[PDB]
Design a protein around this ligand. Structure first.
Ligand code: X3V
Length: 334
């Protein structure tokens, strides 16, 4: 009779009966399942009471909305959105359904990958970001835990970035651009830094800029790339300027030392690709956005250009719990 059924997977998933054989894959928590109507495997993500606070509410709502503003194979697209609750007063949970993938990009980064695989992943990450930029969306918080891959090397970005306080048991900040670390103005190529942080981790198999807080993180950036030029300092607020100028200076190691040929593959082809990879890196991991490569110029770097012309409820302010609940509920039921 009822359209939904419930299964305990530490959380309770109450889902439509078309979705069967639920099992955990990652932590909103996400299950894999078989969709009997579409005859294919899907992923299901549960948002529990996303209206419970402004952080969860703002992200749930904008990401629900922004779905309909994007249609790109490298960007998440939803197959289904539902709530088992029957009315606004009873509304609690949102379920989101998408194509089931094979792995998270974190897992992929731990593997040795040939240049064909690495360069195609990056090409796709750059297409996605370019498509987001075309639709007036600048991510600013791209990181591998929110990117998923299929065995055929195809990739999808699952989130839409920054618009705080978290009352729960943490956010990953290591892929954020200096503009974000230091609170500067930004433009599209803020997202290139993140790609470069991913690319470099693919090579080194270690997070490039770890740290407890932005303090450590910035140390790691300067120690490795050197202190930026005065033209960069002038773009900083006077208070963060004082902070940055008074940190110990650093000459900054060259990129051959940062990514030596030992981390790259036996053939002239691989020798040439390694130098092209290092080159792209050195253009992406550039502290000053004025001298950092753009999405378009990156897409035509020789490392990347081997992979196609075909491949070219607005954001709201602060609301209360009850208003967010209604905004989100309405979106779920168009
Ligand atoms: O994480 C989300 N999606 C997603 C898809 N695939 N994966 C995934 C990671 S690993 C893995 C795997 O192990 N698959 C094996 C088991 O048979 C092959 C599959 C994760 N979130 C998401 C979900 C729905 C709507 C919106 C959002 Cl954002």
């Amino acid at each position: 009779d009822n359209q939904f059924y419930s299964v305990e997977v530490d959380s309770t998933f109450t889902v439509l009966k078309r979705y069967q054989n639920l099992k955990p894959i990652g932590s909103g928590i996400v299950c894999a399942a078989y969709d009997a109507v579409l005859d294919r495997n899907v992923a299901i993500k549960k948002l529990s009471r996303p209206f419970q606070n402004q952080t969860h509410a703002k992200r749930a709502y904008r990401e629900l909305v922004l779905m309909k503003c994007v249609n790109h194979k490298n960007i998440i697209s939803l197959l289904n959105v539902f709530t088992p609750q029957k009315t606004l007063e009873e509304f609690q949970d949102v379920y989101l359904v998408m194509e089931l993938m094979d792995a998270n990009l974190c897992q992929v980064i731990q593997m040795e990958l040939d240049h064909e695989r690495m360069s195609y992943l990056l090409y796709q990450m750059l297409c996605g970001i370019k498509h987001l930029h075309s639709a007036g969306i600048i991510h600013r918080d791209l990181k591998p835990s929110n990117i998923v891959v299929k065995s055929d090397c195809t990739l999808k970005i699952l989130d839409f970035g920054l618009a705080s306080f978290m009352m729960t048991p943490v956010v990953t900040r290591y892929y954020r651009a200096p503009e974000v670390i230091l609170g500067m103005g930004y433009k599209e190529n803020v997202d290139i830094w993140s790609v470069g942080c991913i690319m470099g981790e693919m090579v080194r198999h270690k997070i490039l800029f770890p740290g407890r807080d932005y303090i450590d993180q910035w140390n790691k950036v300067i120690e490795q790339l050197g202190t930026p030029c005065p033209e960069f300092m002038k773009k900083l607020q006077p208070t963060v300027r004082n902070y940055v100028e008074n940190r110990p200076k650093y000459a900054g190691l060259t990129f051959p030392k940062l990514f030596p040929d030992s981390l790259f593959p036996d053939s002239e082809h691989n020798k040439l690709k390694a130098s092209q990879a290092r080159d792209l890196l050195s253009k992406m991991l550039v502290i000053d956005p004025a001298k950092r490569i753009s999405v378009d110029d990156a897409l035509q770097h020789p490392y990347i250009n081997v992979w196609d012309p075909a491949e070219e409820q607005l954001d709201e302010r602060e609301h209360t719990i009850e208003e967010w609940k209604e905004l989100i509920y309405k979106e779920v039921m168009n």
